[PDB]
Amino acid sequence: SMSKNNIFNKYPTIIHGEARGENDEFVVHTRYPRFLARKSFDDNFTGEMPAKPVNGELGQIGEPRRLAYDSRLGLWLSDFIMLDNNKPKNMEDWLGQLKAACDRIAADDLMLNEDAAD
Amino acid sequence: MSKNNIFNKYPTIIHGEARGENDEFVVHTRYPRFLARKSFDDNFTGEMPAKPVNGELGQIGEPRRLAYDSRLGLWLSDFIMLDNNKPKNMEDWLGQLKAACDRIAADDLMLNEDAAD
Ligand SMILES: [Mg+2]
């Protein structure tokens, strides 16, 4: 929806979520491609800002195979729900845009602890 | 329908924050599903209310937009409904939205308590 999308654009691009009773966290991406995702951490996760820029990978996990994002730094993005109803005209470009957004989300998450420290 | 079920995989109430904003956010993953902005009055205390949260829905600003006033300093605004269907009955839709907003406001009040305990 163009109307709905215009309302989405009045939101910050990356929203970090939490829920009572949950150790997993959450995310909302309000710019195209829009989605809601579960943000989870590996046991070894540090939360530290990395020297290199975030370069994750999109892939399939589990049985049945489901789309997941591996930040390669302990952060995972899962259970994606797309908030745009249009189907992407080109899939390869959609995967690239989704992966780039996930990399942005992971780096933004790493900024959370630093901000709290300062 | 199929997107609604993946919504069923999530907790009912999700509390959000964004870098650079003082306003907070909420995602309601049960019907009626939406994303909203959670804002606070200057004098908001966050101390648990003696009586149950009983907010009201109404219209604010010019042009008039739907907003929820918890009556305890918490506001929900800029509602983006995540269900595509239009409700058959509007006043029952408003009642369900209001009930979800009261639950969201009480859950937000519980956040501080949780951090203390
Ligand atoms: Mg497995």
mmCIF file of C-alpha atoms and ligand atoms in Angstrom:
data_model
loop_
_atom_site.group_PDB
_atom_site.id
_atom_site.type_symbol
_atom_site.label_atom_id
_atom_site.label_comp_id
_atom_site.label_asym_id
_atom_site.label_seq_id
_atom_site.Cartn_x
_atom_site.Cartn_y
_atom_site.Cartn_z
ATOM 1 C CA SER A 1 0.000 0.000 0.000
ATOM 2 C CA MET A 2 1.399 3.438 -1.011
ATOM 3 C CA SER A 3 -0.699 4.878 1.721
ATOM 4 C CA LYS A 4 0.555 2.410 4.197
ATOM 5 C CA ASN A 5 4.077 2.886 3.009
ATOM 6 C CA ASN A 6 3.903 6.510 3.410
ATOM 7 C CA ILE A 7 2.958 5.982 7.016
ATOM 8 C CA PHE A 8 5.871 3.536 7.388
ATOM 9 C CA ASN A 9 8.319 6.221 6.223
ATOM 10 C CA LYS A 10 7.437 8.440 9.220
ATOM 11 C CA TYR A 11 9.062 5.709 11.384
ATOM 12 C CA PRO A 12 12.781 5.203 11.989
ATOM 13 C CA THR A 13 14.302 2.761 9.544
ATOM 14 C CA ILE A 14 15.428 0.217 12.145
ATOM 15 C CA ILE A 15 13.379 -0.570 15.250
ATOM 16 C CA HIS A 16 14.764 -2.862 17.915
ATOM 17 C CA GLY A 17 12.282 -4.887 19.949
ATOM 18 C CA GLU A 18 12.009 -6.866 23.128
ATOM 19 C CA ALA A 19 9.283 -8.872 24.826
ATOM 20 C CA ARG A 20 8.587 -9.837 28.375
ATOM 21 C CA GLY A 21 9.436 -13.429 29.038
ATOM 22 C CA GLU A 22 11.697 -13.717 25.965
ATOM 23 C CA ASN A 23 15.464 -13.826 25.586
ATOM 24 C CA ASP A 24 15.202 -13.495 21.820
ATOM 25 C CA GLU A 25 14.837 -9.919 20.545
ATOM 26 C CA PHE A 26 13.082 -8.472 17.574
ATOM 27 C CA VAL A 27 13.340 -6.154 14.698
ATOM 28 C CA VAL A 28 11.252 -4.056 12.388
ATOM 29 C CA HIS A 29 12.540 -2.732 9.101
ATOM 30 C CA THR A 30 10.260 0.067 7.896
ATOM 31 C CA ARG A 31 11.942 0.838 4.575
ATOM 32 C CA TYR A 32 11.763 -1.429 1.550
ATOM 33 C CA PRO A 33 11.761 -4.359 1.863
ATOM 34 C CA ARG A 34 9.725 -4.044 4.992
ATOM 35 C CA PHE A 35 9.632 -6.821 7.502
ATOM 36 C CA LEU A 36 9.358 -8.070 11.056
ATOM 37 C CA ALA A 37 11.996 -10.515 12.184
ATOM 38 C CA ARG A 38 13.224 -12.345 15.250
ATOM 39 C CA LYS A 39 16.750 -11.324 16.288
ATOM 40 C CA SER A 40 18.591 -14.045 18.144
ATOM 41 C CA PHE A 41 22.004 -14.487 19.618
ATOM 42 C CA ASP A 42 24.470 -17.280 19.778
ATOM 43 C CA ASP A 43 25.782 -18.309 23.176
ATOM 44 C CA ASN A 44 29.218 -16.897 22.346
ATOM 45 C CA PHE A 45 27.767 -13.537 21.220
ATOM 46 C CA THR A 46 29.725 -10.592 22.555
ATOM 47 C CA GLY A 47 27.862 -7.633 21.259
ATOM 48 C CA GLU A 48 30.955 -5.835 20.322
ATOM 49 C CA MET A 49 31.466 -3.510 17.466
ATOM 50 C CA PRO A 50 33.516 -5.321 14.905
ATOM 51 C CA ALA A 51 36.487 -3.856 13.069
ATOM 52 C CA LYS A 52 35.276 -4.972 9.723
ATOM 53 C CA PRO A 53 32.005 -3.961 8.286
ATOM 54 C CA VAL A 54 29.144 -6.430 8.726
ATOM 55 C CA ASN A 55 28.922 -8.948 5.871
ATOM 56 C CA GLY A 56 26.253 -11.549 6.683
ATOM 57 C CA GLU A 57 24.724 -14.303 4.706
ATOM 58 C CA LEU A 58 21.139 -15.129 3.758
ATOM 59 C CA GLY A 59 20.341 -18.801 3.645
ATOM 60 C CA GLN A 60 17.961 -21.622 4.731
ATOM 61 C CA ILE A 61 17.927 -23.333 8.076
ATOM 62 C CA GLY A 62 15.918 -26.118 9.650
ATOM 63 C CA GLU A 63 13.508 -28.730 8.352
ATOM 64 C CA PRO A 64 11.374 -27.407 6.695
ATOM 65 C CA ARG A 65 13.934 -25.067 5.147
ATOM 66 C CA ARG A 66 13.244 -21.445 6.195
ATOM 67 C CA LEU A 67 14.868 -18.154 5.252
ATOM 68 C CA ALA A 68 17.322 -16.921 7.879
ATOM 69 C CA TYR A 69 20.094 -14.336 8.065
ATOM 70 C CA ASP A 70 23.444 -15.178 9.675
ATOM 71 C CA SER A 71 25.361 -12.025 10.613
ATOM 72 C CA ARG A 72 28.436 -14.110 11.078
ATOM 73 C CA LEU A 73 28.941 -12.243 14.431
ATOM 74 C CA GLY A 74 26.474 -14.256 16.560
ATOM 75 C CA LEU A 75 23.336 -12.328 15.540
ATOM 76 C CA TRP A 76 20.633 -14.114 13.596
ATOM 77 C CA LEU A 77 17.566 -12.847 11.860
ATOM 78 C CA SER A 78 14.730 -15.182 11.550
ATOM 79 C CA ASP A 79 11.163 -15.808 11.002
ATOM 80 C CA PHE A 80 10.917 -13.091 8.469
ATOM 81 C CA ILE A 81 7.417 -11.651 7.686
ATOM 82 C CA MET A 82 7.358 -9.254 4.849
ATOM 83 C CA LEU A 83 5.271 -6.232 5.425
ATOM 84 C CA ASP A 84 4.935 -5.227 1.763
ATOM 85 C CA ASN A 85 2.342 -7.072 -0.188
ATOM 86 C CA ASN A 86 3.880 -6.771 -3.569
ATOM 87 C CA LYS A 87 5.882 -9.626 -4.972
ATOM 88 C CA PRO A 88 9.322 -8.651 -6.018
ATOM 89 C CA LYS A 89 9.676 -8.461 -9.749
ATOM 90 C CA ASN A 90 13.282 -9.735 -9.586
ATOM 91 C CA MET A 91 14.277 -12.256 -6.901
ATOM 92 C CA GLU A 92 18.034 -11.844 -7.048
ATOM 93 C CA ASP A 93 17.721 -8.099 -6.457
ATOM 94 C CA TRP A 94 15.213 -8.709 -3.661
ATOM 95 C CA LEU A 95 17.660 -11.037 -1.907
ATOM 96 C CA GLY A 96 20.450 -8.490 -2.304
ATOM 97 C CA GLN A 97 18.318 -5.686 -0.861
ATOM 98 C CA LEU A 98 17.113 -7.871 2.009
ATOM 99 C CA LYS A 99 20.669 -8.961 2.810
ATOM 100 C CA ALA A 100 21.930 -5.357 2.742
ATOM 101 C CA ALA A 101 19.137 -4.328 5.108
ATOM 102 C CA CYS A 102 20.016 -7.217 7.434
ATOM 103 C CA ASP A 103 23.673 -6.125 7.484
ATOM 104 C CA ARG A 104 22.540 -2.606 8.399
ATOM 105 C CA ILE A 105 20.336 -4.021 11.175
ATOM 106 C CA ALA A 106 23.163 -6.096 12.648
ATOM 107 C CA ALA A 107 25.600 -3.163 12.725
ATOM 108 C CA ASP A 108 22.902 -0.938 14.227
ATOM 109 C CA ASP A 109 22.338 -3.579 16.910
ATOM 110 C CA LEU A 110 26.050 -3.613 17.756
ATOM 111 C CA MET A 111 25.788 0.122 18.267
ATOM 112 C CA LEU A 112 23.335 -0.428 21.136
ATOM 113 C CA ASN A 113 25.831 -1.499 23.702
ATOM 114 C CA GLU A 114 28.288 1.170 22.795
ATOM 115 C CA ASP A 115 25.604 3.758 23.202
ATOM 116 C CA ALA A 116 24.704 2.374 26.593
ATOM 117 C CA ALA A 117 28.331 2.427 27.607
ATOM 118 C CA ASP A 118 28.500 6.084 26.712
ATOM 119 C CA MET B 1 -3.877 -15.821 6.909
ATOM 120 C CA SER B 2 -0.523 -17.479 6.198
ATOM 121 C CA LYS B 3 1.181 -14.254 7.313
ATOM 122 C CA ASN B 4 -1.112 -14.231 10.347
ATOM 123 C CA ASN B 5 0.211 -17.663 11.356
ATOM 124 C CA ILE B 6 3.832 -16.554 11.204
ATOM 125 C CA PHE B 7 2.634 -13.679 13.373
ATOM 126 C CA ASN B 8 1.383 -16.386 15.749
ATOM 127 C CA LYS B 9 5.014 -17.430 16.158
ATOM 128 C CA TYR B 10 5.758 -14.092 17.942
ATOM 129 C CA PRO B 11 5.044 -12.835 21.455
ATOM 130 C CA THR B 12 1.840 -10.824 21.565
ATOM 131 C CA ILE B 13 3.430 -7.518 22.605
ATOM 132 C CA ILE B 14 6.783 -6.313 21.257
ATOM 133 C CA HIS B 15 8.339 -3.174 22.735
ATOM 134 C CA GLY B 16 10.652 -1.276 20.411
ATOM 135 C CA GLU B 17 13.213 1.505 20.541
ATOM 136 C CA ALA B 18 15.191 3.192 17.823
ATOM 137 C CA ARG B 19 18.550 4.864 17.912
ATOM 138 C CA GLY B 20 18.215 8.547 17.979
ATOM 139 C CA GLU B 21 14.648 8.639 19.207
ATOM 140 C CA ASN B 22 13.090 9.255 22.477
ATOM 141 C CA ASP B 23 9.816 7.885 21.263
ATOM 142 C CA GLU B 24 9.401 4.152 21.624
ATOM 143 C CA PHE B 25 7.497 1.692 19.462
ATOM 144 C CA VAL B 26 5.138 -1.252 19.764
ATOM 145 C CA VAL B 27 4.167 -4.198 17.584
ATOM 146 C CA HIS B 28 0.920 -6.042 18.333
ATOM 147 C CA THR B 29 1.102 -9.499 16.732
ATOM 148 C CA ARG B 30 -2.392 -10.738 17.604
ATOM 149 C CA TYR B 31 -5.578 -9.477 16.013
ATOM 150 C CA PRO B 32 -5.872 -6.625 15.456
ATOM 151 C CA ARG B 33 -2.210 -6.513 14.427
ATOM 152 C CA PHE B 34 -0.425 -3.215 14.091
ATOM 153 C CA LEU B 35 2.710 -1.144 14.542
ATOM 154 C CA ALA B 36 2.434 1.994 16.629
ATOM 155 C CA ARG B 37 4.465 4.718 18.158
ATOM 156 C CA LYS B 38 4.614 4.709 21.980
ATOM 157 C CA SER B 39 5.219 8.196 23.367
ATOM 158 C CA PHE B 40 5.260 9.590 26.854
ATOM 159 C CA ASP B 41 4.080 12.713 28.500
ATOM 160 C CA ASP B 42 6.562 14.783 30.348
ATOM 161 C CA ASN B 43 5.229 13.873 33.709
ATOM 162 C CA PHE B 44 4.911 10.156 33.085
ATOM 163 C CA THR B 45 6.031 8.307 36.138
ATOM 164 C CA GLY B 46 5.793 4.753 35.023
ATOM 165 C CA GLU B 47 4.598 3.672 38.472
ATOM 166 C CA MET B 48 1.996 0.926 38.437
ATOM 167 C CA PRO B 49 -1.576 2.113 38.632
ATOM 168 C CA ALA B 50 -3.793 1.112 41.527
ATOM 169 C CA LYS B 51 -6.713 0.442 39.168
ATOM 170 C CA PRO B 52 -6.462 -1.433 35.856
ATOM 171 C CA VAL B 53 -5.359 0.590 32.838
ATOM 172 C CA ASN B 54 -8.485 2.106 31.222
ATOM 173 C CA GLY B 55 -7.422 4.293 28.294
ATOM 174 C CA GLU B 56 -9.427 5.857 25.513
ATOM 175 C CA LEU B 57 -9.229 5.951 21.743
ATOM 176 C CA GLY B 58 -9.858 9.232 19.988
ATOM 177 C CA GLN B 59 -8.652 11.677 17.375
ATOM 178 C CA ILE B 60 -5.789 14.124 17.812
ATOM 179 C CA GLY B 61 -4.260 16.877 15.729
ATOM 180 C CA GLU B 62 -5.317 18.593 12.529
ATOM 181 C CA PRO B 63 -5.915 16.549 10.370
ATOM 182 C CA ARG B 64 -7.581 14.234 12.898
ATOM 183 C CA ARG B 65 -5.697 10.970 13.407
ATOM 184 C CA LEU B 66 -6.531 7.966 15.564
ATOM 185 C CA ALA B 67 -4.608 7.947 18.849
ATOM 186 C CA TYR B 68 -4.736 6.092 22.151
ATOM 187 C CA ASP B 69 -4.353 7.920 25.462
ATOM 188 C CA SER B 70 -3.657 5.533 28.338
ATOM 189 C CA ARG B 71 -4.570 8.224 30.761
ATOM 190 C CA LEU B 72 -1.325 7.529 32.590
ATOM 191 C CA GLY B 73 1.029 9.477 30.297
ATOM 192 C CA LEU B 74 1.458 6.736 27.662
ATOM 193 C CA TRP B 75 0.261 7.417 24.101
ATOM 194 C CA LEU B 76 -0.029 5.146 21.069
ATOM 195 C CA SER B 77 -0.086 6.939 17.705
ATOM 196 C CA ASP B 78 0.492 6.517 14.011
ATOM 197 C CA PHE B 79 -1.234 3.147 13.893
ATOM 198 C CA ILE B 80 -0.274 0.954 10.932
ATOM 199 C CA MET B 81 -2.622 -2.015 10.764
ATOM 200 C CA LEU B 82 -0.838 -5.149 9.736
ATOM 201 C CA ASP B 83 -3.921 -7.131 8.852
ATOM 202 C CA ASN B 84 -5.143 -6.302 5.382
ATOM 203 C CA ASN B 85 -8.751 -7.052 5.879
ATOM 204 C CA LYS B 86 -11.186 -4.385 6.789
ATOM 205 C CA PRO B 87 -13.325 -5.076 9.806
ATOM 206 C CA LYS B 88 -16.948 -5.853 9.321
ATOM 207 C CA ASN B 89 -17.982 -3.923 12.357
ATOM 208 C CA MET B 90 -16.190 -0.716 13.260
ATOM 209 C CA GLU B 91 -17.160 -0.244 16.927
ATOM 210 C CA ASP B 92 -16.215 -3.817 17.834
ATOM 211 C CA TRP B 93 -12.938 -3.187 15.976
ATOM 212 C CA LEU B 94 -12.412 -0.082 18.120
ATOM 213 C CA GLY B 95 -13.200 -2.094 21.247
ATOM 214 C CA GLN B 96 -10.660 -4.785 20.349
ATOM 215 C CA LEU B 97 -8.034 -2.167 19.467
ATOM 216 C CA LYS B 98 -8.680 -0.408 22.782
ATOM 217 C CA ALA B 99 -8.388 -3.676 24.727
ATOM 218 C CA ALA B 100 -5.067 -4.433 23.031
ATOM 219 C CA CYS B 101 -3.838 -0.903 23.803
ATOM 220 C CA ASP B 102 -4.717 -1.243 27.509
ATOM 221 C CA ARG B 103 -2.802 -4.531 27.625
ATOM 222 C CA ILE B 104 0.166 -2.895 25.861
ATOM 223 C CA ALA B 105 0.211 0.018 28.310
ATOM 224 C CA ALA B 106 0.126 -2.288 31.342
ATOM 225 C CA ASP B 107 2.897 -4.445 29.841
ATOM 226 C CA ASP B 108 4.982 -1.311 29.354
ATOM 227 C CA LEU B 109 4.430 -0.408 32.991
ATOM 228 C CA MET B 110 5.687 -3.857 33.895
ATOM 229 C CA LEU B 111 8.951 -3.321 32.099
ATOM 230 C CA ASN B 112 10.390 -1.163 34.840
ATOM 231 C CA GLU B 113 9.289 -3.460 37.510
ATOM 232 C CA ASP B 114 10.981 -6.320 35.709
ATOM 233 C CA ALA B 115 14.215 -4.325 35.500
ATOM 234 C CA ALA B 116 14.069 -3.667 39.251
ATOM 235 C CA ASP B 117 13.347 -7.316 40.157
HETATM 236 MG MG MG C 1 18.692 -27.994 12.916
#
